[PDB]
Design an enzyme around this catalytic site. Structure first.
Site, PDB file in Angstrom:
ATOM      1  N   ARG A 168      -4.016  -1.818  -5.538  1.00 54.96           N
ATOM      2  CA  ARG A 168      -3.886  -3.129  -5.095  1.00 54.96           C
ATOM      3  C   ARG A 168      -4.086  -3.737  -3.967  1.00 54.96           C
ATOM      4  O   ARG A 168      -3.526  -3.137  -2.963  1.00 54.96           O
ATOM      5  CB  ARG A 168      -2.579  -3.629  -5.858  1.00 54.96           C
ATOM      6  CG  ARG A 168      -1.946  -4.871  -5.341  1.00 54.96           C
ATOM      7  CD  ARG A 168      -0.499  -5.017  -5.887  1.00 54.96           C
ATOM      8  NE  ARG A 168      -0.369  -4.637  -7.230  1.00 54.96           N
ATOM      9  CZ  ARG A 168       0.773  -5.020  -7.972  1.00 54.96           C
ATOM     10  NH1 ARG A 168       1.974  -5.468  -7.099  1.00 54.96           N
ATOM     11  NH2 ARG A 168       0.911  -5.000  -9.189  1.00 54.96           N
ATOM     12  N   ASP A 208       7.432  -0.382  -5.168  1.00 57.08           N
ATOM     13  CA  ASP A 208       7.139  -1.081  -4.380  1.00 57.08           C
ATOM     14  C   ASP A 208       6.129  -2.281  -4.854  1.00 57.08           C
ATOM     15  O   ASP A 208       5.282  -2.070  -5.781  1.00 57.08           O
ATOM     16  CB  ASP A 208       6.229  -0.577  -3.318  1.00 57.08           C
ATOM     17  CG  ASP A 208       5.491  -1.391  -2.147  1.00 57.08           C
ATOM     18  OD1 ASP A 208       6.225  -2.257  -1.737  1.00 57.08           O
ATOM     19  OD2 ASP A 208       4.574  -1.235  -1.629  1.00 57.08           O
ATOM     20  N   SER A 229       3.694   0.422   2.822  1.00 57.30           N
ATOM     21  CA  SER A 229       5.034  -0.246   2.211  1.00 57.30           C
ATOM     22  C   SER A 229       5.529   0.676   1.339  1.00 57.30           C
ATOM     23  O   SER A 229       6.635   0.682   1.406  1.00 57.30           O
ATOM     24  CB  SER A 229       4.696  -1.537   1.827  1.00 57.30           C
ATOM     25  OG  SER A 229       3.339  -1.666   0.860  1.00 57.30           O
ATOM     26  N   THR A 235       0.815  -1.233  -0.030  1.00 58.08           N
ATOM     27  CA  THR A 235       0.195   0.073   0.077  1.00 58.08           C
ATOM     28  C   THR A 235       0.879   1.308   0.065  1.00 58.08           C
ATOM     29  O   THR A 235       1.994   1.379   0.389  1.00 58.08           O
ATOM     30  CB  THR A 235      -0.832  -0.119   1.265  1.00 58.08           C
ATOM     31  OG1 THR A 235      -2.145  -1.089   0.985  1.00 58.08           O
ATOM     32  CG2 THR A 235      -1.932   1.317   0.999  1.00 58.08           C
ATOM     33  N   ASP A 264      -3.124   3.893  -3.993  1.00 60.32           N
ATOM     34  CA  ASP A 264      -3.014   3.023  -5.103  1.00 60.32           C
ATOM     35  C   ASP A 264      -4.102   2.028  -4.766  1.00 60.32           C
ATOM     36  O   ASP A 264      -4.605   1.858  -3.767  1.00 60.32           O
ATOM     37  CB  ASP A 264      -1.551   2.260  -5.005  1.00 60.32           C
ATOM     38  CG  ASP A 264      -1.527   1.276  -3.880  1.00 60.32           C
ATOM     39  OD1 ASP A 264      -1.972   1.409  -2.850  1.00 60.32           O
ATOM     40  OD2 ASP A 264      -1.022  -0.064  -4.216  1.00 60.32           O
ATOM     41  N   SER A 292       2.370  -2.561  -3.948  1.00 62.20           N
ATOM     42  CA  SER A 292       1.409  -1.519  -4.280  1.00 62.20           C
ATOM     43  C   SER A 292       1.319  -1.345  -5.982  1.00 62.20           C
ATOM     44  O   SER A 292       2.064  -1.766  -6.573  1.00 62.20           O
ATOM     45  CB  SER A 292       2.018  -0.101  -4.067  1.00 62.20           C
ATOM     46  OG  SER A 292       2.000  -0.005  -2.484  1.00 62.20           O
ATOM     47  N   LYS A 342      -9.099   2.448  -1.308  1.00 66.47           N
ATOM     48  CA  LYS A 342      -8.543   2.600  -0.136  1.00 66.47           C
ATOM     49  C   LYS A 342      -8.805   3.890   0.405  1.00 66.47           C
ATOM     50  O   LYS A 342      -8.422   4.148   1.567  1.00 66.47           O
ATOM     51  CB  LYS A 342      -6.868   2.280  -0.089  1.00 66.47           C
ATOM     52  CG  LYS A 342      -6.477   1.076  -0.576  1.00 66.47           C
ATOM     53  CD  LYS A 342      -5.373   0.758  -0.723  1.00 66.47           C
ATOM     54  CE  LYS A 342      -4.774  -0.722  -1.324  1.00 66.47           C
ATOM     55  NZ  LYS A 342      -3.480  -0.522  -1.884  1.00 66.47           N
ATOM     56  N   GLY A 350      -2.010  -0.859   6.853  1.00 67.91           N
ATOM     57  CA  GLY A 350      -1.977  -1.854   7.999  1.00 67.91           C
ATOM     58  C   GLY A 350      -2.819  -2.959   7.581  1.00 67.91           C
ATOM     59  O   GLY A 350      -3.292  -3.232   6.456  1.00 67.91           O
TER      60      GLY A 350
END
Lengths: 219, 209, 234, 204, 228, 244, 206, 229, 267
Positions: free
Chosen positions: A19, A166, A129, A1, A17, A169, A33, A47
């Site tokens: 995913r 990342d 992340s 995330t 994002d 994400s 999100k 989280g």
């Protein structure tokens, strides 16, 4: 995330994002999100999804009673505070991490809430992340009294750093814009990963799979 | 940090037809040190015929001595002013130790006293309260050598009545030998002789090193 | 929580709540128990024959365990509560002790439930008397009665409820040691019709033997009421 | 692992005013096979199917709680619960047990009787929803199900083509999984009918 | 004190529930009207003096986005129920992620009223509610009384001028009223029983329509009052 | 049997509530509050009957927190109990939401505390009227507006432009009604509102007031805190009134 | 898994069998403990596991069923309800303070019409259960270390239409296979049959 | 009855509930105990309410422990509760200190529980004579609803109390034998009973200092005492 | 405050619980409710209040769960109430919850007598403990179970209950029992049983023509069992028939209000 927020001259821009993953597999490419808290306050969540969902819901319900009771607009500080009390009590077992943004009579407000219950009000934030990658776009590109357009371009660029660097994400940018008067969600503001090779269509003619037994039921 | 300390030292008792003799050393040990050479907490009088004698952790023996001292005061108030006999206190004590089954007193105890016929007895306990009445008993740091010696001299099972005086000399000899060899036992011994008349006491020196 | 003191003494050693509970028993339908050689007979009066009442009537004689029955007089709802506690108690006992509860033990449990309700703040006494009968595992019958005060006692035969004293007087004369199963039924029916109007379908009847029990049918119960209506004209 | 003790897999896909949900039929204790006739699907009402995988004692207990709450809902509310409320409800119950979880992972598939819109949800064991538009799956061969569906599923499909996609998926995935198998059961649901099919598979 | 205050009297009456009911009937008039596409509820809010601030007196209340209410009788008792109702709605949302249907909310209010007629050491609520909302089954108007009894209505009134208000609505009510002509009828019915001149500052009005409950502002309500 | 507990009479009235309202006048004091353009003022009687009392210890005005003040009218120690619960309510609200309680919401919570004793049995009602005073922010432009709320023993909570409470309230409220007709209170200066309030007292009590006889509190746009007005600033109002 | 149990259902009966052994570590205390406990006139349960969990558990089932039969005029409960009751208690204990009953069960019943109004399908039912609360109807099932050997023989030889005599032979062979191949000694089996006429011991099966 | 509470004091410092409970004991059967030097003797009127009652089941003499027994008067069902607390205390003592409870301690323990009311709605309407041997020889104690307990050389409780306390201030001397007390017992039962006196109609128990065991007399051995009269 | 206690759970000088008695009077004042047992099911009928033009429907998605007087408790049990309406709703929740707990535990339908006992025990509890009034309700339960077939029960304020073949509670219940007594018989169809119910209500309301808008009828009967899902449940077994509780609408009462007016004129 990768979730991001910035303050600009007349309000807040949140970004995310899309995913969601289980393990190392994409479960949902287009998950949402950015969550509603109140008419003038939204939250992006990272989280543990269950924990982030439960606490946001709970505080959004409690803010709604409070507006019926007072007959006043929710203050961003009130949300921040109900959030932190709840996470403090559970000693980080409830492992929600949140960017909270809104606008109330005292102007724009943007804060992070970590899972142990600590808060930080700041003009730009990232979490999740891909927070590091994202945060490197924000420190090179934030300035004071950005216009709406500059803010949107900065948030999107910060999310795209997460998306491409990342592994947890991916997919696209969602923005939310919050101003004194309205809140505007913008799902798929940026879609930097569209298809290239159009999918090969694989067909099964009906009656491909051997059935032993069938029953029917009219509704 | 443990809740447990072993402060060391030794007690020993011997009974005969109308007396019991009870001894405990007066050293209180710490970790690689000595707090004092004159602790008298090991032996505690409960009635005029009954003593408690304890080794192990001293703070525990002080608690147990107080819990016994108030159960005994309560018995008197509920029993017309009478004191429980030695047999009853011994049964009381077992009962109480068992009850801390789950966080136990770190104590090796003896109840020592006259029976109802006027004769000595000694009850040795384990830390959770199993006991029997016996003619002699010992516990603590030096007890694994004092005890075969008393087995030897009093029962004489591998060979072909004592006075108060001969018995007090045997115990004096047994503590003297314990102090020579057990590094945690020393300084003095406090001896109480229990008869129906009353209680005579006598300190007795031992090695200081 | 309500904690008021309901059952209290008054100026001559009277507990009125207990008395009035025993009044409620006197208005309730009549019940009878009769101990034979090797059978116990419980017999109760039913309200009144109706076309509408259900032929398979509800039973007013309850099983407490494989070898122990209860009949009562008084507030029927209070009694159902009491019977519940007693069924629990018997099963509790099997679980704690493996063996099956003795009648005399089960009676003291029930009687103490009644006694406590005369002393427990917050609560009124039950308005019930019971007749409890059953066997040992050595095959010897016992019949007990319990009253609202909590007092229990054993009997060779007993009546409770309405016209208790009249039935009880009839039974003091006519009772006989070592009656058979059939004699016991006879004598129980007879005893009842000193209080009750007719004997068609206003009587239910249990024959509790060692290792059996029977809620008598309407064919066998008509047979006995006519053997007894024929004897009452003499 | 405890979620893999009992075996089993479930999959649900959407089409155009239809879905299909499939489960395998195996019940096990790690590698020992107890039964080959335990499908994991539960019909809630005309519109909603529930799949449960994870530990079988908790599947059995958690579906009885769902059934109990649904019965009371229907008497209070005098109506059938919709797919989305049922899922929010399921979620709430899993998270009630957040520090001592039900080891189940549900797959809910539904259709709005009016609008003909299809709702799919899968949940983790503390109730986090994952509500995409193509498919969902869970259980011991979920990794191998993902890629079957990404390559066979396409928007638009009607009941009979969605059924083949969804049966080829479950079979090919159960065949690389030692704890799911013994063929499958499938429910196919439209606004108008509910068809069930027992599909043949391997006997290992 | 944990004993009941509400009891049976020899003829089967529960008098504390009838005195409470009496108090709900002595309250200022309120009424409601259900159209084919919305609901409207309305109430007198007269102050005792012009020293009071009119704008802060509430008689109509939002309970959630889709439902509202008004009352007659004892104001302060009404706040307890409004608070309970508002909580139950949020609770239903958290559980099912949708708006609590009006029928369910009204059975929750009822059972709260009913608690206070059996519980120890309490008197009954001395107010009756009109509840107005919209859900997947449409538009609803309910009345709940101190006994805990509720009825669905097409149109009704509670409080002192209610036999006449109800008479007047019998005549003017049709099954094919539009929402704007239901507001008109609502206002017109208030006007008849009303002592003194009726203003936008001593009347309050709510309206369900498009699945949403909303109080009229003073200014919106001045618009509808110059037309009648 | 209804005169002694929280049950309805046969006319749907609650008797303990009505008698609690009598407790309010029984205490013999008059209070006047008034809201002008930029401020809110409260003017209560400071009676020190006893020559030996320390007059700075007799008060009806209290802070609930920095920004909210009260004036107790009625049975004084029932007043102070509500001051303590109000303080506890204010402090819990601030810990839970992280901002100070608004005066409108405070007043509603104290009203609910009263209502609950009208409906449960066994606790006496507080025989007071609590007048709360403070500034409240509007959501729109963020301006601060003066408020006055009163809560009474029935649990009723209402807002006012001005109000008299206590002995002779009927005569004093009529005097304020007359003087409302000249110009709305919300258009007045602090001084002009004060002359009205002070003369409401003088009319009703039937006397002439010195500064020592009243205590006065004040919240204003300039300073949001509830604060006592010093005796000199009240002498200048009383002087202005003896003249005109 | 030191105690093997076995059961299978045929058209008009269930056979159940359990090994007699009670052991203290490696020592055989006795080999004749009956572990096939009758719950009612047409029910049995074979439990596997320690004496203590096993006894406490089946005594709790028995007493609660007995209490359900007087609060219901002696009406026999269906096998599928007894199983559902057993399952809820295994499952409940598993999340309780005192923890799970470590017993594995096979419940066998034959259901018989209460009254004339009763529409119930009348016949034999077998249920497998585990100490976790797993429960499943089955045509045959087993627990303990001997379970795998027997399950495969029965997959090979069991049919629904075995006569009572053939099903005793098959039960006997399954017990012999357990003796031959399991190192723990299950030397003596007690075997009971559940039929329309009730529970009865099978003596020729040892 | 409800006009004044369970705790109320009278104007002369009695608690009403306790006065009324003592009145209750007066309407009881009669029961008594007599202390010799050798032994302590207890007896009661049975008073069955018909000849269909099995008389065994209506005992007013109960063993508390091997060396002590009680005879109760007043409300029998309430006495069952006291006699159970006393059985439990007597066995807790032996558990904890491996010897028999003194008789006085037992009377003390039974009185503590009498006055726990305000919790229980009312006193116990019961008085007990406890009789036994410990080290102080044969003893006889009496407890009442006030929670006073008291030692007696000979007492009676019940309907025939006041009449039995004028056969005491005459015939009772401290120095009598077993025999003379076993006979004095039955003399008083004959007097204040309403019925004719029979072996089934009364109960007698002794605790002799010789052996320290309560013994309950057969009907064979109660014949021998009516005979001696 | 103890001097203002009413003493709801305290016997009075004759072994009588006045509050139990006064609460039974309240039921006699309530709308008439009738139950009839037939061979093909149970019938429950109830009079309603007078129909104001301005009433409205709740417009519930399912019509066979609750009328004005009839309630489903579970799919093999329904009921009708007389007495304090809000008191009835508290107990009906109690019963719905108990019936569903039993399904939860034994996965089988609770027997109607077992359900009835739990209901009546709850009532008895407010007669002995707790210083508050009793529930002022009487119920008629219609039930089907495999132990006992169709069953009709009545539950009274004392916490007592009894079985019946026909019964009537509320207003004119003596007049109603008089009529059922005469005309009930053990061979009734469910359509005749419905008729007989309508006649008995027609003669207690006091009208010549049966106003279909003043009547509620519900039937507990059996219907052919739905789908057998042998693929999702291979060890499921359903009987041929299952109980249903049905709250008859006006379109089913048309040929039955007609057959009660041809039996009203031919008399």
């Amino acid at each position: 995330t990768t979730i991001v927020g910035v303050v600009y001259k007349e309000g807040v821009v949140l970004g995310a994002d899309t995913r969601a993953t289980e393990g190392s597999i994409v479960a949902d490419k287009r998950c949402k999100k950015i969550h509603y808290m109140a008419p003038n306050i939204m939250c992006c969540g990272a989280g543990t999804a269950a924990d982030t969902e439960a606490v946001t819901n709970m505080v959004s319900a409690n803010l709604a009673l409070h507006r019926l009771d007072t007959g006043k607009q929710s203050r961003v500080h009130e949300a921040l505070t109900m959030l932190k009390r709840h996470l403090y009590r559970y000693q980080g077992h409830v492992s929600a991490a949140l960017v909270l943004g809104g606008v109330d009579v005292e102007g724009p407000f943007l804060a992070t809430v970590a899972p142990h219950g600590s808060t930080d009000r700041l003009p730009f934030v990232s979490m999740g992340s891909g927070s590091i990658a994202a945060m490197s776009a924000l420190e090179t590109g934030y300035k004071e009294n950005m216009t709406l357009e500059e803010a949107k371009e900065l948030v999107a660029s910060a999310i795209r750093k997460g998306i491409f660097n990342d592994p947890y994400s991916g997919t696209q940018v969602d923005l939310c814009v919050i101003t004194k008067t309205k809140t505007e969600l913008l799902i798929g503001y940026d879609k930097p990963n569209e298809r290239k090779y159009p999918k090969q269509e694989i067909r099964f003619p009906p009656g491909t799979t051997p059935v032993l037994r069938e029953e029917i039921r009219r509704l | 940090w443990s809740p447990y300390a072993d402060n060391g030292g030794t007690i020993a008792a011997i009974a005969g037809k109308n007396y019991v003799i009870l001894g405990g050393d007066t050293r209180l040990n710490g970790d690689f040190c000595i707090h004092t050479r004159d602790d008298r907490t090991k032996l505690f009088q409960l009635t005029e015929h009954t003593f408690l004698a304890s080794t192990g952790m001293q703070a525990d023996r002080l608690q147990l001595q107080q819990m016994l001292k108030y159960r005994i005061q309560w018995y008197q108030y509920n029993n017309g002013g009478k004191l429980p006999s030695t047999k009853a206190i011994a049964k009381l004590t077992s009962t109480m130790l068992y009850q801390r089954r789950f966080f136990p007193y770190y104590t090796f105890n003896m109840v020592v006293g006259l029976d109802e016929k006027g004769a000595g007895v000694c009850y040795s306990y384990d830390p959770v309260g199993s006991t029997e009445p016996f003619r002699y008993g010992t516990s603590g740091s030096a007890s694994s050598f004092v005890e075969p010696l008393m087995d030897c001299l009093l029962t004489r099972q591998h060979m072909v009545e004592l006075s108060m005086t001969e018995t007090l000399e045997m115990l004096k000899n047994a503590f003297t030998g314990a102090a020579e060899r057990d590094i945690f036992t020393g300084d003095a011994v406090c001896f109480h002789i229990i008869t129906a008349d009353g209680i005579r006491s006598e300190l007795f020196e031992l090695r200081n090193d | 929580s309500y904690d008021r003191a309901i059952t209290v003494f008054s100026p001559d050693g009277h507990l009125f709540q207990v008395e009035y509970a025993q009044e409620a028993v006197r208005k309730g339908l009549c019940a009878v128990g009769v101990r034979g050689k090797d059978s116990i007979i419980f017999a109760v009066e039913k309200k009144s024959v109706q076309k509408l009442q259900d032929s398979r009537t509800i039973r007013k004689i309850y099983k407490l365990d494989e070898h122990i029955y209860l009949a009562f007089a008084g507030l029927s709802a209070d009694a159902r509560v009491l019977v519940n506690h007693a069924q629990l108690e018997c099963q509790r006992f099997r679980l704690n002790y493996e063996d099956a509860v003795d009648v005399d033990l089960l009676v003291r449990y029930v009687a103490k439930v009644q006694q406590k309700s005369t002393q427990s703040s917050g609560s009124r006494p039950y308005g019930v008397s019971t007749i409890i009968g059953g066997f040992n595992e050595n095959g010897q019958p016992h019949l007990w009665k319990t009253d609202p005060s909590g007092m229990s006692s054993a009997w060779r035969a007993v009546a409770i409820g309405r016209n208790d004293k009249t039935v009880l007087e009839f039974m003091e004369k006519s009772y006989q040691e070592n009656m058979t199963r059939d004699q016991c039924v006879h004598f129980a029916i007879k005893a009842l019709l000193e209080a009750v109007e007719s004997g068609s379908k206003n009587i239910e009847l249990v024959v509790l033997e060692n290792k059996k029990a029977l809620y008598m049918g309407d064919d066998e119960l008509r047979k006995f009421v006519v053997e007894v209506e024929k004897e009452r004209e003499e | 692992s405890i979620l893999t003790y009992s075996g089993g897999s479930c999959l649900a896909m959407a089409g155009d005013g239809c879905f299909v949900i499939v489960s395998d039929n195996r019940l096990g204790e790690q590698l020992k096979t107890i039964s080959m006739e335990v499908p994991k699907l539960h019909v809630i009402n005309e519109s909603i199917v529930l799949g449960l995988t994870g530990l079988r004692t908790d599947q059995q207990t958690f579906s009885e709680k769902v059934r109990f709450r649904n019965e009371l809902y229907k008497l209070r509310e005098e109506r059938e619960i919709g797919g989305k409320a049922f899922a929010a409800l399921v979620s709430s119950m899993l998270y009630e047990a957040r520090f001592g979880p039900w080891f189940v992972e549900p797959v809910i598939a539904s259709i709005d009787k009016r609008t003909g819109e299809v709702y799919l949800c899968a949940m983790d064991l503390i109730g986090a929803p994952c509500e995409p538009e193509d498919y969902v799956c869970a259980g011991t061969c979920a990794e191998s199900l993902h890629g079957m569906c990404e390559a066979l599923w396409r928007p638009g499909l009607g009941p009979e083509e969605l059924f083949e996609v969804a049966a080829q998926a479950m079979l090919s995935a159960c065949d690389r999984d030692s704890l799911s198998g013994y063929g499958a059961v499938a429910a196919i649901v439209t606004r108008d009918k509910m068809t069930t099919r027992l599909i043949n598979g391997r006997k290992d | 004190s944990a004993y009941g205050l509400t009891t049976f009297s020899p003829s089967g009456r529960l008098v504390q529930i009838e005195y409470a009911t009496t108090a709900a009937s002595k309250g200022t008039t309120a009424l409601g009207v259900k159209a084919m596409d919305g609901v409207v509820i309305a109430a007198e809010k007269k102050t005792t003096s012009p020293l009071a601030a009119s704008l802060t007196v509430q008689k109509v209340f939002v309970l959630d986005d889709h439902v509202g209410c008004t009352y007659s009788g004892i104001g302060p008792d009404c706040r307890v129920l409004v608070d309970a109702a508002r909580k139950a709605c949020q609770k239903y949302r958290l559980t099912y992620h949708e708006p609590m249907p009006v029928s369910q909310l009204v059975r929750h209010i009822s059972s709260l009223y009913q608690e206070f007629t059996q519980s120890g050491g309490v008197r009954p609520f001395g107010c009756s509610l009109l509840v107005a909302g919209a859900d997947s089954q449409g538009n609803h108007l309910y009345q709940v009384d101190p006994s805990g009894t509720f009825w669905a209505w097409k149109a009704t009134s509670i409080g002192k001028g209610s036999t006449d208000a109800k008479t007047f609505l019998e005549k003017r009510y049709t099954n094919e009223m539009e929402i704007e002509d239901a507001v008109h009828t609502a206002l017109l019915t208030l006007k008849e029983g009303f002592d003194g001149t009726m203003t936008a500052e001593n009347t309050q009005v709510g309206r369900v329509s498009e699945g949403k409950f909303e109080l009229f502002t003073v200014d919106q309500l001045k618009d509808y009052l110059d037309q009648i | 049997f209804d005169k002694y507990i929280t049950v309805f009479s046969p006319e749907g009235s609650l008797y303990q509530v009505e008698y609690a309202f009598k407790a309010v006048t029984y205490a013999g004091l008059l209070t006047v509050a008034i809201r002008c353009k930029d401020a809110v003022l409260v003017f209560t009687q400071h009676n020190v009957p006893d020559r030996l009392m320390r007059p700075d210890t007799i008060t009806s005005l209290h802070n609930i927190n920095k920004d909210i003040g009260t004036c107790i009218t009625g049975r004084a120690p029932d007043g102070k109990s509500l001051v303590q619960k109000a303080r506890q309510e204010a402090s819990e609200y601030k810990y839970r939401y992280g901002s100070p309680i608004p005066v409108s919401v405070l007043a509603k919570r104290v009203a609910d505390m009263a209502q609950v004793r009208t409906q449960h049995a066994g606790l006496r009602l507080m025989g007071v009227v609590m007048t709360f005073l403070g500034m409240e922010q509007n959501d729109a432009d963020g301006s601060w507006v003066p408020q006055i709320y009163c809560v009474d023993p029935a649990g009723w909570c209402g807002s006012y432009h001005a109000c008299a409470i206590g002995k002779k309230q009927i005569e004093a409220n009529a005097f304020l009604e007359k003087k409302q007709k000249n110009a709305p209170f919300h258009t007045l200066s602090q001084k002009d509102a004060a002359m009205i309030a002070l003369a409401a007292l003088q009319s009703a009590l039937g006397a002439s007031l010195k500064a020592t006889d009243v205590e006065v509190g004040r919240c204003s746009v300039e300073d949001h805190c509830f604060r006592r007005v010093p005796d000199e600033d009240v002498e200048e109002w009383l002087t202005a009134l003896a003249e005109a | 898994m030191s105690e093997t149990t076995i059961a299978f259902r045929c058209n008009g009966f269930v056979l159940v069998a359990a090994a007699g052994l009670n052991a203290f570590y490696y020592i055989k205390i006795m080999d004749t403990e009956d572990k096939v406990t009758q719950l009612d006139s047409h029910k049995v349960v074979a439990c596997a596991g320690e004496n203590g969990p096993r006894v406490n558990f089946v005594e709790y089932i028995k007493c609660n069923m007995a209490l359900k039969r007087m609060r219901e005029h002696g009406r026999v409960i269906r096998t599928s309800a007894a199983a559902s009751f057993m399952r809820n208690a295994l499952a409940g204990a598993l999340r309780s303070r005192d923890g799970a009953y470590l017993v594995n069960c096979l419940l066998a019943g034959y259901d018989v019409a209460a009254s004339s109004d009763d529409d119930i399908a009348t016949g034999p039912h077998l249920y497998y259960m585990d100490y976790l609360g797993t429960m499943q109807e089955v045509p045959y099932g087993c627990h303990g270390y001997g379970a795998s050997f027997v399950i495969a023989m029965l997959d090979r030889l069991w049919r629904p239409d075995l006569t009572a005599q053939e099903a005793v032979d098959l039960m006997q062979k399954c017990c012999d296979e357990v003796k031959k191949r399991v190192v723990i000694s299950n030397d003596k089996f007690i075997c009971k049959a559940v039929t329309e006429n009730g529970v009865e011991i099978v003596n020729t099966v040892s | 009855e409800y006009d004044r509470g369970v705790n109320t004091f009278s104007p002369e410092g009695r608690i009403f509930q306790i006065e009324y409970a003592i009145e209750a004991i007066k309407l009881g059967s009669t029961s008594l105990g007599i202390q010799t030097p050798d032994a302590v003797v207890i007896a009661a009127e049975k008073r069955v309410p018909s000849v269909l009652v099995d008389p065994s089941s209506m005992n007013k003499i109960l063993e508390i422990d091997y060396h002590m027994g009680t005879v109760l008067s007043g409300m029998v069902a309430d006495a069952r509760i006291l006699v159970e607390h006393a059985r439990v205390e007597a066995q807790n003592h032996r558990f904890t200190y491996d010897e028999p409870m003194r008789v006085e301690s037992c009377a003390l323990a039974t009185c503590d529980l009498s006055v726990r009311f305000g919790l229980m709605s009312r006193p116990f309407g019961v008085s007990l004579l406890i009789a036994g041997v410990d080290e102080n020889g044969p003893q006889l104690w009496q407890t009442d609803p006030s929670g006073t307990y008291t030692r007696y050389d000979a007492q009676a409780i019940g309907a025939g109390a006041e009449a039995a306390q004028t056969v005491f201030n005459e015939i009772y001397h401290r120095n009598m034998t077993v025999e003379e007390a076993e006979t004095l017992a039955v003399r008083i039962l004959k007097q204040v009973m309403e019925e004719e006196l029979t072996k089934s109609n009364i109960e007698i128990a002794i605790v002799p200092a010789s052996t320290g065991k309560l013994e309950v007399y057969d009907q064979t051995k109660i014949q021998r005492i009516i005979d001696r009269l | 405050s103890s001097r203002y206690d009413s003493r709801t759970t305290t016997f009075s000088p004759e072994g009588r619980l006045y509050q139990v008695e006064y609460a039974e009077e309240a039921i006699s004042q309530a709308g008439t409710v009738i139950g009839i047992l037939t061979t093909g099911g149970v019938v429950l009928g109830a009079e309603k209040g007078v129909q104001n033009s301005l009433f409205d429907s709740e417009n519930m998605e399912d019509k066979n769960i609750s009328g004005e007087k009839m309630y489903k408790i579970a799919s093999h049990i329904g009921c009708s109430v007389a007495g304090v309406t809000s008191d009835a709703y508290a107990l009906l929740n109690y019963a719905r919850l108990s019936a569903n707990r039993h399904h939860y535990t034994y996965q089988e339908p609770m027997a109607a007598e077992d359900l009835c006992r739990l209901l009546c025990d709850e009532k008895q509890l407010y007669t002995q403990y707790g210083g508050v009034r009793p529930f002022g309700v009487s119920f008629l339960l219609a039930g089907w179970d495999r132990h006992h077939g169709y069953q009709l029960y009545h539950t009274d304020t004392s916490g007592n209950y009894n079985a019946w073949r026909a019964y009537a509670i509320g207003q004119n219940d003596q007049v109603a029992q008089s009529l059922l007594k005469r005309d009930w018989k053990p061979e009734l169809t469910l359509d005749e049983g419905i008729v007989l119910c309508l006649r008995v209500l027609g003669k207690t309301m006091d009208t010549v023509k049966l106003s279909a808008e003043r009547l509620e009828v519900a039937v507990l009967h059996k219907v052919p069992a739905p789908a057998t899902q042998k693929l999702l449940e291979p060890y499921g077994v359903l009987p041929k028939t299952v109980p249903e509780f049905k709250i008859l609408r006006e379109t089913d009462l048309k040929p039955l209000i007609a057959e009660a007016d041809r039996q009203r004129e031919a008399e």
